[PDB]
Structure formats: structure tokens, C-alpha cells
Amino acid sequence: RTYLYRGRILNLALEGRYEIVEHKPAVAVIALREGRMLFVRQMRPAVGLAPLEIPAGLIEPGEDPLEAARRELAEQTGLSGDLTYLFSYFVSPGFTDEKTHVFLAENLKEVEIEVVWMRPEEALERHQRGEVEFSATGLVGVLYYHAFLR
Amino acid sequence: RTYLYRGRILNLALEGRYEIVEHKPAVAVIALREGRMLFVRQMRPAVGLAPLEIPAGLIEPGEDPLEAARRELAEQTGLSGDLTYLFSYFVSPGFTDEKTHVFLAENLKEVEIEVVWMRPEEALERHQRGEVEFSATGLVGVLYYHAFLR
Ligand SMILES: [Zn+2]
Ligand SMILES: [Zn+2]
Ligand SMILES: [Zn+2]
Ligand SMILES: [Zn+2]
């Protein structure tokens, strides 16, 4: 386990033959209101475009997933709500340890990055038409909706 | 766009203030048979455990997504089938450009990593119980099933 780089949000290490990127864990929030899902878009230099995502971010020191979810929702959309933990996933276990904890937000209230309210059916349609790209969080939100929120 | 490391499956670069990991694109295959989804597990040093995933891998030079999907399915499970492109997603656009193309496989045939046939409902239950972890591909497969394959 030798380190080649220690950065701000990631470290690059070598474990034998494997190249490993250590990354802080993240959270993502699925929120539905009047049939529209709360998506967000922002310039992502890593990909050179703005994919359709849902409110998400890195867990700060001292924070547990639930608290980070509350914070990211408020900072990105100015909203607050009743949060329920759904599930988690490793974004790409073949090279990084980034783990994402997904929550559902209900009873949204305005308490205070482009906010994109859109019907999940439309988001999926646009993507199929090649008009927009998805981040893992955006796709998970869309599929979760079709599976359990209709 | 300065490079700090050029590796086998990834390059570490710096674009101004952003740390960027360039990664080859990938494919993932969702396959259902008799109510069971085709999951796979393998030791993943990046996370120190074996999460529940679906057949997936990197696209090789000269390959398009469909061909890579065919290959990964055959090499990991010894199966072949009729493949249909579903959608794609960026695993974590905040730092890497890894993009995953997801396909559906039908009419599986044996033509020739642990193969784990499991009902998606059971996979979800086990995860909720904290008995197993999910990779993004595994979760996407589970949600896709609940949304469109029941
Ligand atoms: Zn943040
Ligand atoms: Zn921070
Ligand atoms: Zn491979
Ligand atoms: Zn290869």
C-alpha cells in the first residue's frame, strides 16, 4: 500500500499490482414533488459536461451520512425535509473506495449548481434521445422512482 | 491539464484546482432468468471486500460497448445472449470520467469471479440487512429489475 499522491478529495495508491484511488464517502438525496424529481446540474471538469445528477456531495469530517445528506440538500437547493436512508453503493469498486449513501427526502420545505425539477420519465426519455447524460446518482434516482414511487 | 501519473487503467491529472482521474469506459450486463438476476462477486482490493455486482468490465481497444458487453458476459459467466442497450452513466463525475454503458441480456445460452444467481428482491433484502454491499452496477441492476422487469 504505497502512496503516489495525497490530494484534497483523493489519494492515489498502489497495492501490489492494483492502482487504487482513495476517496471520501458521499451522499445523494432522492426527492419527489408533484411528480417531478429534484435533479441538479453543474460544470464537471472531469467529464467536460453537465450530467443530470441529484443533490449529492462528500461527507465532511464529524458528519454521519444523514447529516451530510441534510447539508447537501440545503446548500444545493435551499430545501429541508424528512430523510430516510435507502441503500448504499460503491461507485466503481474496481479502482476506488468511494461509497455513496442514498436517502429519500419527503415533506420538503424551503429553509434558505443549477436546480432542475424534472419528471423522471422525461429525464429518462431525454437520456435515451441522447440529449442529456446521467451521473450514477441521477440514474439511481430515476430507477428508484420507477420502481417504488409511482 | 497536467498529468501526475499515467497508469494501466487510470491516469491522474490536475486541471487547475481539480484533481481528475481518467478511466477507460465500462459496460455492465443485466440478465434475468427464472426470477434470478445474474450477479458476480470478486475480491476488490480497492474496497477490501466483495460487493454484489453484475457482469461488467472495461471496453478494450477496438471494441464498441455492445461487443465489450458480449465479451464480459462470456468471460465472466460463460454465457451469451441477445443484448439490448439500456442507458449509460458517469460513475462519479466529480472526479473521474469513467462512463458505464448498461445492457440487458435475454435468451441466455451457455457457450463456454464468483457467479451469483439471486432474486433481486433477496439481494435488496440482504443489503438492507447489511449482509452484503452493492457496486453501482449491482444496485442499478436491482433497481432496473424492480422498475421494468416484474
Ligand atoms: Zn459539498
Ligand atoms: Zn469539503
Ligand atoms: Zn475485462
Ligand atoms: Zn484489458
Coordinates of C-alpha atoms and ligand atoms in Angstrom, one line a residue:
Chain A
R1 CA 0.0 0.0 0.0
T2 CA 2.3 2.8 -1.3
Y3 CA 1.0 6.3 -1.9
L4 CA 1.9 8.2 -5.0
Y5 CA -0.3 11.2 -4.3
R6 CA -2.2 12.6 -1.3
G7 CA -4.7 15.2 -2.5
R8 CA -7.8 17.2 -1.4
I9 CA -10.6 14.8 -2.3
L10 CA -8.5 11.7 -3.3
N11 CA -5.2 9.8 -2.7
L12 CA -3.6 7.7 -5.4
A13 CA -2.1 4.5 -4.1
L14 CA -0.5 1.3 -5.3
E15 CA -1.4 -2.0 -3.6
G16 CA 0.8 -4.5 -5.3
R17 CA -0.4 -4.5 -9.0
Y18 CA -3.6 -2.6 -8.3
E19 CA -4.0 1.2 -8.7
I20 CA -6.3 2.5 -6.0
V21 CA -7.9 5.8 -5.6
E22 CA -9.0 6.5 -2.0
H23 CA -12.0 8.9 -2.0
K24 CA -14.2 10.3 0.8
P25 CA -17.6 8.7 1.1
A26 CA -20.6 10.6 -0.4
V27 CA -24.4 11.0 0.0
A28 CA -27.2 11.5 -2.5
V29 CA -30.7 12.6 -2.0
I30 CA -33.8 11.5 -4.0
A31 CA -36.7 14.0 -3.7
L32 CA -40.0 13.9 -5.5
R33 CA -42.6 16.7 -5.5
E34 CA -45.7 16.9 -7.7
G35 CA -44.3 14.1 -9.9
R36 CA -41.0 16.0 -10.5
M37 CA -37.7 14.7 -9.2
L38 CA -35.1 17.1 -7.8
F39 CA -32.1 17.0 -10.2
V40 CA -29.1 19.3 -10.2
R41 CA -26.5 20.1 -12.8
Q42 CA -23.1 21.7 -12.6
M43 CA -20.0 22.0 -14.7
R44 CA -18.0 18.8 -14.1
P45 CA -14.4 19.3 -15.4
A46 CA -13.7 15.6 -15.1
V47 CA -16.2 14.9 -17.9
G48 CA -16.4 18.2 -19.7
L49 CA -20.1 18.5 -19.5
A50 CA -23.0 18.8 -17.0
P51 CA -24.7 15.5 -16.4
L52 CA -28.1 15.1 -14.7
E53 CA -27.4 14.3 -11.0
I54 CA -29.4 14.6 -7.8
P55 CA -28.3 16.6 -4.7
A56 CA -25.1 14.9 -3.6
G57 CA -21.8 15.6 -2.0
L58 CA -18.9 14.4 0.2
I59 CA -19.4 13.7 3.9
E60 CA -17.4 16.3 5.9
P61 CA -15.3 15.4 9.0
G62 CA -17.5 14.9 12.0
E63 CA -20.6 14.2 9.9
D64 CA -22.5 10.9 9.5
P65 CA -24.4 10.2 6.2
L66 CA -27.7 11.6 7.4
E67 CA -26.3 14.9 8.4
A68 CA -24.3 15.2 5.2
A69 CA -27.5 14.5 3.3
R70 CA -29.3 17.3 5.1
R71 CA -26.5 19.7 4.5
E72 CA -26.0 18.9 0.8
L73 CA -29.8 19.3 0.2
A74 CA -29.9 22.7 1.9
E75 CA -26.7 24.1 0.3
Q76 CA -27.6 23.0 -3.2
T77 CA -31.3 23.6 -3.2
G78 CA -32.1 25.6 -0.1
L79 CA -34.5 22.8 1.0
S80 CA -35.0 20.7 4.1
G81 CA -37.1 17.5 4.6
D82 CA -37.7 14.3 6.4
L83 CA -34.9 12.0 5.3
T84 CA -34.9 8.2 5.2
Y85 CA -31.9 6.0 4.4
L86 CA -32.4 3.8 1.4
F87 CA -29.2 2.0 0.4
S88 CA -25.5 2.5 -0.5
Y89 CA -23.2 1.5 -3.3
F90 CA -19.5 1.6 -4.3
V91 CA -19.3 3.9 -7.4
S92 CA -16.6 1.8 -9.0
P93 CA -15.0 -0.9 -6.7
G94 CA -12.5 -1.9 -9.4
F95 CA -10.4 1.1 -8.6
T96 CA -11.9 3.4 -5.9
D97 CA -13.4 3.0 -2.5
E98 CA -15.9 5.9 -2.9
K99 CA -19.1 4.7 -1.3
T100 CA -22.4 6.6 -1.7
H101 CA -25.2 6.6 0.8
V102 CA -28.6 7.3 -0.8
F103 CA -31.5 8.9 1.1
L104 CA -35.1 9.7 0.3
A105 CA -36.4 13.2 1.2
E106 CA -40.1 13.9 1.9
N107 CA -42.1 16.9 3.1
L108 CA -39.7 19.4 1.5
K109 CA -39.6 22.9 2.9
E110 CA -37.7 25.9 1.8
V111 CA -35.3 26.9 4.5
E112 CA -32.9 29.2 2.6
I113 CA -25.3 24.5 -9.1
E114 CA -28.5 24.5 -11.3
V115 CA -31.7 23.2 -9.8
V116 CA -33.5 21.1 -12.3
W117 CA -37.0 19.8 -11.3
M118 CA -38.0 17.3 -13.9
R119 CA -40.3 14.3 -14.2
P120 CA -38.2 11.2 -14.1
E121 CA -40.0 9.9 -17.1
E122 CA -38.8 12.9 -19.0
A123 CA -35.2 12.6 -17.7
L124 CA -35.1 9.0 -18.9
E125 CA -36.6 10.0 -22.3
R126 CA -34.1 12.8 -22.8
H127 CA -31.3 10.5 -22.0
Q128 CA -32.5 7.8 -24.4
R129 CA -32.6 10.5 -27.0
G130 CA -29.0 11.4 -26.2
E131 CA -30.0 14.9 -25.1
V132 CA -28.6 14.5 -21.6
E133 CA -26.1 12.3 -19.7
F134 CA -26.6 10.8 -16.2
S135 CA -24.4 10.6 -13.2
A136 CA -24.7 7.4 -11.2
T137 CA -26.8 9.3 -8.6
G138 CA -29.1 10.7 -11.3
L139 CA -29.8 7.2 -12.8
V140 CA -30.3 5.6 -9.4
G141 CA -32.8 8.3 -8.6
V142 CA -34.7 7.7 -11.9
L143 CA -34.7 3.9 -11.5
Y144 CA -35.7 4.1 -7.8
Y145 CA -38.6 6.3 -8.7
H146 CA -39.9 4.0 -11.5
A147 CA -39.5 1.0 -9.1
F148 CA -41.1 2.3 -5.9
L149 CA -42.5 5.9 -6.1
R150 CA -45.3 5.5 -8.8
Chain B
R1 CA -4.3 19.6 -17.8
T2 CA -1.1 18.3 -16.2
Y3 CA -0.5 14.6 -15.6
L4 CA 0.9 13.3 -12.4
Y5 CA 0.5 9.6 -13.2
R6 CA -0.2 7.5 -16.3
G7 CA -1.2 4.0 -15.3
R8 CA -2.7 0.8 -16.6
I9 CA -6.4 1.6 -16.1
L10 CA -6.2 5.2 -15.0
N11 CA -4.3 8.4 -15.3
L12 CA -4.1 11.1 -12.5
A13 CA -4.3 14.6 -13.8
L14 CA -4.7 18.2 -12.5
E15 CA -6.8 20.6 -14.3
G16 CA -6.3 23.9 -12.5
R17 CA -7.6 23.2 -9.0
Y18 CA -9.4 20.0 -9.9
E19 CA -8.0 16.5 -9.4
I20 CA -9.1 14.3 -12.3
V21 CA -8.8 10.5 -12.8
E22 CA -9.1 9.5 -16.4
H23 CA -10.5 6.0 -16.7
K24 CA -11.5 3.7 -19.6
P25 CA -15.2 3.4 -20.2
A26 CA -17.0 0.3 -19.0
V27 CA -20.0 -1.9 -19.7
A28 CA -22.4 -3.8 -17.4
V29 CA -24.9 -6.5 -18.3
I30 CA -28.3 -7.0 -16.6
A31 CA -29.6 -10.6 -17.0
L32 CA -32.7 -12.2 -15.6
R33 CA -33.6 -15.9 -15.7
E34 CA -36.4 -17.7 -13.8
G35 CA -36.7 -14.6 -11.5
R36 CA -33.0 -14.6 -10.6
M37 CA -30.6 -11.9 -11.6
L38 CA -27.0 -12.7 -12.7
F39 CA -24.7 -11.1 -10.1
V40 CA -21.0 -11.7 -9.8
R41 CA -18.6 -11.2 -6.9
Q42 CA -14.8 -10.9 -6.8
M43 CA -12.1 -9.7 -4.4
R44 CA -11.9 -5.9 -4.9
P45 CA -8.7 -4.6 -3.2
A46 CA -9.8 -1.0 -3.6
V47 CA -12.6 -1.7 -1.0
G48 CA -11.3 -4.7 0.9
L49 CA -14.4 -6.8 0.3
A50 CA -16.5 -8.4 -2.4
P51 CA -19.6 -6.3 -3.3
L52 CA -22.5 -7.7 -5.3
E53 CA -22.0 -6.6 -8.9
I54 CA -23.4 -7.7 -12.3
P55 CA -21.1 -8.8 -15.2
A56 CA -19.1 -5.7 -16.0
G57 CA -15.7 -4.7 -17.3
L58 CA -13.6 -2.2 -19.3
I59 CA -14.0 -1.7 -23.0
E60 CA -10.9 -3.0 -24.9
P61 CA -9.2 -1.1 -27.7
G62 CA -11.1 -1.6 -31.0
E63 CA -14.3 -2.5 -29.1
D64 CA -17.6 -0.7 -29.0
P65 CA -19.9 -1.0 -25.9
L66 CA -22.0 -3.9 -27.3
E67 CA -19.0 -6.0 -28.2
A68 CA -17.4 -5.4 -24.8
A69 CA -20.7 -6.4 -23.1
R70 CA -20.8 -9.6 -25.1
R71 CA -17.2 -10.4 -24.1
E72 CA -17.5 -9.6 -20.4
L73 CA -20.7 -11.8 -20.2
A74 CA -18.9 -14.7 -21.8
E75 CA -15.6 -14.4 -19.9
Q76 CA -17.2 -14.0 -16.5
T77 CA -20.2 -16.4 -16.8
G78 CA -19.6 -18.4 -20.0
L79 CA -22.9 -17.1 -21.3
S80 CA -24.1 -15.5 -24.5
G81 CA -27.4 -13.7 -25.2
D82 CA -29.4 -11.1 -27.2
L83 CA -28.2 -7.8 -25.9
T84 CA -30.1 -4.5 -25.8
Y85 CA -28.6 -1.1 -24.9
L86 CA -30.4 0.5 -22.0
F87 CA -28.6 3.6 -20.8
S88 CA -25.3 4.9 -19.5
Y89 CA -24.0 6.8 -16.5
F90 CA -20.8 8.5 -15.2
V91 CA -19.8 6.6 -12.1
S92 CA -18.6 9.7 -10.2
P93 CA -18.4 12.9 -12.4
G94 CA -17.0 14.9 -9.6
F95 CA -13.5 13.4 -10.1
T96 CA -13.5 10.7 -12.8
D97 CA -14.7 10.4 -16.4
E98 CA -15.4 6.7 -16.2
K99 CA -18.7 6.1 -18.1
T100 CA -20.6 2.9 -17.9
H101 CA -22.9 1.6 -20.7
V102 CA -25.6 -0.8 -19.4
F103 CA -27.2 -3.6 -21.5
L104 CA -30.0 -6.1 -21.0
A105 CA -29.3 -9.7 -21.9
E106 CA -32.0 -12.1 -22.9
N107 CA -32.3 -15.7 -24.2
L108 CA -29.1 -16.7 -22.4
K109 CA -27.2 -19.7 -23.7
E110 CA -24.1 -21.4 -22.3
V111 CA -21.3 -21.0 -24.8
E112 CA -18.3 -21.9 -22.6
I113 CA -15.1 -14.3 -10.4
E114 CA -18.0 -16.0 -8.5
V115 CA -21.3 -16.3 -10.3
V116 CA -24.1 -15.4 -8.0
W117 CA -27.7 -16.1 -9.4
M118 CA -30.0 -14.4 -6.9
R119 CA -33.5 -12.9 -6.9
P120 CA -33.2 -9.1 -6.9
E121 CA -35.7 -9.0 -4.0
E122 CA -33.3 -11.1 -2.0
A123 CA -30.2 -9.1 -3.0
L124 CA -32.0 -5.9 -1.8
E125 CA -33.2 -7.5 1.4
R126 CA -29.7 -8.8 2.2
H127 CA -28.2 -5.3 1.6
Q128 CA -30.8 -3.7 3.8
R129 CA -29.8 -6.2 6.5
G130 CA -26.2 -5.1 6.0
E131 CA -25.2 -8.6 4.9
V132 CA -23.9 -7.5 1.5
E133 CA -22.7 -4.4 -0.2
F134 CA -23.6 -3.2 -3.7
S135 CA -21.4 -1.8 -6.6
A136 CA -23.1 0.8 -8.7
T137 CA -23.7 -1.8 -11.4
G138 CA -25.3 -4.2 -8.9
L139 CA -27.7 -1.6 -7.5
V140 CA -28.6 -0.3 -11.0
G141 CA -29.5 -3.9 -12.0
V142 CA -31.6 -4.4 -8.9
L143 CA -33.5 -1.1 -9.4
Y144 CA -33.9 -1.7 -13.1
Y145 CA -35.5 -5.0 -12.4
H146 CA -38.0 -3.7 -9.8
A147 CA -38.9 -0.9 -12.2
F148 CA -39.3 -2.7 -15.5
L149 CA -38.9 -6.5 -15.3
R150 CA -41.6 -7.6 -12.9
Ligands
ZN1 ZN -20.1 19.6 -0.6
ZN2 ZN -15.5 19.6 2.0
ZN3 ZN -12.2 -7.3 -18.5
ZN4 ZN -7.9 -5.0 -20.7

